[PDB]
Amino acid sequence: GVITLDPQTASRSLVLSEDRKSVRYTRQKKNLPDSPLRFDGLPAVLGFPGFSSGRHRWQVDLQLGDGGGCTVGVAGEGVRRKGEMGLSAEDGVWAVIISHQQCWASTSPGTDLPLSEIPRGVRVALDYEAGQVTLHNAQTQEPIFTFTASFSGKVFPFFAVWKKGSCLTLKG
């Protein structure tokens, strides 16, 4: 199922590609119009569509710039869009944060992940009725994390990326 990046949610710190399948961080903010839906404080963007039911999978390839990082997972539709405050599963973000030496799951408090290696891609699997979000290393199949939750209403693919040279690209 085709997932794309939703420009109407994208932080001004994010440049979506013309095909809306990739996104890079920009130090110079884009002139995106103000909206209550738009991330402002975190360099984040939702996917489209969101999901109310069923099993869904997608893959995110990632490149990090110097001192860079990204966040890959899922977010409840009610996720706060405004402020610089880090989001966690309390805020309805179930994601892994990847940086050059250190990856962590967005539990509350956060879980440091002792991975064989830093991923260069992440496979996300949502099972809405099972209340599970599973993350694997897309290339090696190393398990990264499994979140267990009870979902109500729509759950969206969630992405964030930061520092120059950092970028994400969606695959099937």
| Domain-wise residue ranges, the chain | 4-171
The structure was resolved to a resolution in Å of: 1.7
Bridge partners (DSSP) of residue 112 are 104
Contact yes or no for 81/38 (Cβ under 8 A):
yes
In degrees, rounded to 5, the angle at the alpha carbon of residue 65 between the alpha carbons of residues 48 and 25 is: 40
Phi/psi at 161 (nearest 5 deg)? -150, 140
C-alpha separations of 38 from 8, 27, 147, 171 in Å: 6, 17, 25, 24
Q: Report the C-alpha gap between 50 and 69 in whole angstroms.
A: 24
- CATH architecture, domain 4-171: Sandwich (2.60)
User: Cβ contacts of residue 18 below 8 Å, gap of 6+?
Assistant: none
Contact yes or no for 46/9 (Cβ under 8 A):
yes
Does 49 sit behind a cis peptide bond, omega within 30 degrees of 0 on the bond before it? yes
C-alpha separations of 64 from 8, 74, 123 in Å: 24, 20, 17
- Indicate which technique resolved this structure: X-ray
C-alpha torsion sign, points 67, 72, 75, 81 = positive
The two three-digit tokens of residue 69, written as one number: 């990082």
Sheet holding 103-105, edge to edge: 4-5, 44-48, 155-162, 69-76, 93-99, 103-105, 111-113
C-alpha torsion sign, points 102, 132, 1, 79 = negative
Q: Report the C-alpha gap between 160 and 43 in whole angstroms.
A: 5
